[PDB]
Amino acid sequence: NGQSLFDRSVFNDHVFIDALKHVISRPGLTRKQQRQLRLSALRYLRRQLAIWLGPIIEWRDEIVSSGSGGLELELITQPKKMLPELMLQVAGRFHLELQNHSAGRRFAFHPALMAPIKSQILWLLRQLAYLHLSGLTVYDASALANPYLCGIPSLSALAGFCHDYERRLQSLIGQSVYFRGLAW
């Protein structure tokens, strides 16, 4: 469809902006205080990094598992082992996305955020590196449900099918097995 696969609002959280300020931080506090604020910000941001690439990773998993041409689509289609080598490219795009945002103009490409962003991305990449019956075909089904109506086959017939299937399975498995519902 030619559209961006990236999150439409991960950067719209005022907390994100604060988180960045906390990574940047301030003097005057003790080591414990600074570390606690810092680590908390980083954990938050870590989550945002996972969210930011979320729909993108979702696309990958869905499509690849189930069975074009843009890099944010093709580089994720590739082998998971390769993903760690995309870290610099992801980090680049990240700053750009901030650069294109109303608030991120104060932060993008700031030296202070370099290693933090790169490290958390690298971590994420390393980390990245009911009975369902499918495909059934029926030939010559009866399309006349009752003498009054043509259309979808009679539902009394599907309820019937669920049960004949249940009885056959029950004669095979010693344990009691029971079907509460059936979807079409």
Partner: protein, 50 residues
Amino acid sequence: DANLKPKNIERYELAYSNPQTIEACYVPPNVDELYCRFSLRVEANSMRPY
């Protein structure tokens, strides 16, 4: 950026050159003079609306 924040650029990043492709024209060595010529026609044509 809008004469407000000076951009993030690290010191070393502006020492780089900016290459460009240009056309140019020079008089070759040992020519004594250059000539330029054109022609001009004048018509008495403001006396009547086209």
